[PDB]
């Protein structure tokens, strides 16, 4: 979907019908293109939402790990994630977001315990 790859013009060159365009107006060409671009955007969006569902489960489990390590009363939530991460990273749930490093730092500060 990303960049549409000039889908309208590539489809419009096909909609010339090997240059037999003589019985189709200019209105038909644009409307078919707009439908194909919208369906390409929808197909991209549905796939991206499937990736998000995998991340939603891991955010709760990492929050459960951070709560087990840094509870309300037992260990205070660090003021800087670098101090936290140096002491956190033996446990496997911080390693389960080791490709999602921007998410793991944000959800740590935004944990808000109790």
From Swiss-Prot:
What stretches pass through the bilayer? none
Q: Which domain of life is it from?
A: Eukaryota
Domain FF residues, every copy: 1-50, 53-114
Coiled-coil region(s): none
Q: Where in the cell is it found?
A: Nucleus
Q: What does this protein do?
A: Required for pre-spliceosome formation, which is the first step of pre-mRNA splicing. This protein is associated with snRNP U1. Two commitment complexes, CC1 and CC2, have been defined in yeast. CC1 is a basal complex dependent only on the 5' splice site. CC2 is a complex of lower mobility and is dependent on a branchpoint as well as a 5' splice site region. This protein is involved in CC2 formation where it binds to the branchpoint binding protein MSL5, bridging the U1 snRNP-associated 5' splice site and the MSL5-associated branch point 3' intron splice site.
What information about domains appears in the record's comments? The WW and FF domains bind to the phosphorylated carboxy-terminal domain of RPB1.
Family, per entry: Belongs to the PRPF40 family.
Could you describe the subunit structure of this protein? Interacts with CRM1, MSL5, PRP8, and the RNA polymerase II largest subunit (RPB1). MSL5, MUD2 and PRP40 interact to form the commitment complex 2 (CC2), a precursor of mature spliceosomes.
Protein's name in the database: Pre-mRNA-processing protein PRP40
Q: Native species of this protein?
A: Saccharomyces cerevisiae (strain ATCC 204508 / S288c) (Baker's yeast)
**Which residues of the whole protein are included?**
439 to 552 of 583
